[PDB]
Design a protein around this ligand. Structure first.
Ligand SMILES: OC[C@H]1O[C@@](CO)(O[C@H]2O[C@H](CO)[C@@H](O)[C@H](O)[C@H]2O)[C@@H](O)[C@@H]1O
Ligand SMILES: [Mg+2]
Length: 580
DNA sequence: TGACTCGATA
DNA sequence: CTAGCGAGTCAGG
């Protein structure tokens, strides 16, 4: 049965009620400076469809959109907010976002459209967006009749589902998580994405030229050492050269052939000079193809800025993800790739980049949740946690801790946060499972609180069916009861890791909200540009650096109060690279 | 187009 | 051993 609605030719007063489900449709996946193809409004007075040219040009409708007292319920309000920002229109009063609500109720459902969220409550009177717009190559905006009904059905679904979703969130003790954390954060992310980050394209282009030269040199050296030319970028062709032509030992297999991952190559390096060259080629090619070429492809030709899109409803732990471009995995470990960051610069003259990061937030969160006396004392003394761990597990004084010992203790600490595994640790440290098991046993002997925590959280996940974070985010773990060891073990590691990674996510998200409130109170021109899980990157006039040095770390350190202090380090400079 | 294998970040 | 995004090459639909 068709859904009744008014195909309005002009905006009317009954369309501007103080409570409504609103749909401002942007079909392009990347919504930056993208077209708004249609608008739908459902309220106490009925259902309406408005053509964008009409509504967005109407003074009354625009005022309604920006009126904080006129409440709107939507799905992915950030998409609409940003698309409107590019049009110079402000969207206010969004009191309910179905996408974020669905995400909080169950991140594993992968809700990506109204139909998916609705199906959670057995509501199916709305079509999936993919069904209406098509996949990708066959993607397109249908004729007005089809488009209008779809937008109205989505608005109708939002209108009907708000109550049941809010009711379940309340039962889950997630009502404040939606209203006081995720929704306000959505507006902040919208501002960050819209602002974008300025890129020194000339510098990237120069780097591209330098890499192309090096890539060619190493490429030729590889053919020379191999005695023939082949496609180095093909793990298949490479494997033939390495394990057949050059007779290198096969220390590991993938699933469809020879394994050529860096970890494998590093072990084969001593056998042939070609290996070190393959690794070098790998490094350079990664920088060239993924970063230099990737960034240059998405930088806006006019402003020279990149506008990432932070997916706020994707990760299973509560973290954000970044796309087109992903600005959360820009090189930093190796100097060569790190220089890429010199191309990220302030958007205005005489401004600087400011970066603040939490020091060991995950281990501090673990200390808090496990209430481990030894771990809490370590952070209360602000000790080097890896040296501290080495001292305890290897039973030596601080002065006796050697570099190799600290390295292994660090690997142990990573395993503890990830969900410790003798096999996983053994693989990471290139030792036997028995040896890794011994390190783990020593760790739990030194940190009995952590041991108790890991045991208890797994039992809790089994009893309740899910685990939670400090701010009540949840993750269901049905595999925790599997009778398949590998499947169950993965779930157990998730039970151990999610409260840690997730609570750290909760904390920085709250810090972002608190920070923006403080920046506004102080009327600072400084503003957020990026978030990279445990760090915040801003840009601001050089004259604001001294104030930021005190303000940002304090806001981040005070976002939440734990049993151990939170510590934030900071740096600033002329480019992202220099903010070190 | 999409399953794989690779590698970048925290 | 946790969580992401995405480029390259390859083959099964
Ligand atoms: O607008 C981001 C928001 O949209 C979803 C779908 O509801 O993802 C779409 O947009 C992303 C950014 O362009 C794409 O990476 C993704 O492929 C596309 O489906 C949500 O996942 C996200 O929260
Ligand atoms: Mg850090």
């Amino acid at each position: 049965a068709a859904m009744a609605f008014t195909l309005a030719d002009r905006v009317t007063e009954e369309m501007l009620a103080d409570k409504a489900a609103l749909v401002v449709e942007v079909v392009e996946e990347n919504y930056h400076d993208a077209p708004i193809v249609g608008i739908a409004v459902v309220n106490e007075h009925g259902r309406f469809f408005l053509r964008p040219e009409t509504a967005l040009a109407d003074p009354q409708f625009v005022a309604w959109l920006g009126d904080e007292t006129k409440k709107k319920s939507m799905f992915d309000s950030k998409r609409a907010a940003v698309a409107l920002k590019w049009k110079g229109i402000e969207l206010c009063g969004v009191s309910f976002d179905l996408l974020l609500a669905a995400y909080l109720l169950d991140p594993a459902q992968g809700v990506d459209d109204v139909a998916a969220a609705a199906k959670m409550k057995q509501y199916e009177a709305v079509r999936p967006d993919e069904a209406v717009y098509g996949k990708g190559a066959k993607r397109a905006v249908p004729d007005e009749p089809v488009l209008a009904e779809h937008l109205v059905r989505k608005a109708a679904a939002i209108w009907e589902l708000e109550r049941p979703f809010l009711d379940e969130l309340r039962r889950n003790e997630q009502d404040r998580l939606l209203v006081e954390l995720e929704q306000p954060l959505s507006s902040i992310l919208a501002e960050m994405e819209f602002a974008g980050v300025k890129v020194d394209t000339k510098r990237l282009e120069q780097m591209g030229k330098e890499l192309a030269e090096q890539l060619g040199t190493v490429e030729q050296r590889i053919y020379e050492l191999a005695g023939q030319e082949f496609n180095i970028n093909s793990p298949k062709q490479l494997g033939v050269i390495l394990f057949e032509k050059l007779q290198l030992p096969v220390l590991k297999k993938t699933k469809t052939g020879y394994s050529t991952s860096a970890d494998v190559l590093e072990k084969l390096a001593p056998y042939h000079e070609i290996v070190e060259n393959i690794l070098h080629y790998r490094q350079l090619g990664k920088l060239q193809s993924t970063y230099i070429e990737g960034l240059l492809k998405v930088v806006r030709p006019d402003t020279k800025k990149v506008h990432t899109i932070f997916n706020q409803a994707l990760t299973q732990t509560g973290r954000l993800s970044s796309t087109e471009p992903n600005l959360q995995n820009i090189p930093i470990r190796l100097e060569e790739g790190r220089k890429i960051r010199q191309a990220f610069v302030p958007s205005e003259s005489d401004w600087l980049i400011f970066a603040a990061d939490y020091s060991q937030i995950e281990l501090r969160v673990l200390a808090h949740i496990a209430e481990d006396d030894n771990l809490m004392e370590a952070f209360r003394r602000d000790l080097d946690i890896h040296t501290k761990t080495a001292m305890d597990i290897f039973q030596v004084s601080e002065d006796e801790v050697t570099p190799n010992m600290r390295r292994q203790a660090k690997a142990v600490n990573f395993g503890i946060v990830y969900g410790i595994s003798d096999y996983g640790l053994a693989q990471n440290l290139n030792i036997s499972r028995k040896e890794a098991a011994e390190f783990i046993e020593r760790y739990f002997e030194s940190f009995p609180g952590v041991k108790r925590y890991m045991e208890n959280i797994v039992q809790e996940a089994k009893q309740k069916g899910y685990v939670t974070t400090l701010l009540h985010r949840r993750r269901y773990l049905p595999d925790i009861t599997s009778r398949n060891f590998n499947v169950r073990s993965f779930a157990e590691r998730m039970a151990m890791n999610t409260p840690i990674q997730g609570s750290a996510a909760d904390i920085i998200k709250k810090a972002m909200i608190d920070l923006n409130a403080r920046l506004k109170e102080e009327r600072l021109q400084a503003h957020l540009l990026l978030q990279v899980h445990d760090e915040l990157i801003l840009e601001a006039p050089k004259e604001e650096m001294e104030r930021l040095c005190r303000l940002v770390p304090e806001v981040m350190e005070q976002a939440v109060t734990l049993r151990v202090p939170l510590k934030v380090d900071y740096h600033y400079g002329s480019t992202w690279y220099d903010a070190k």
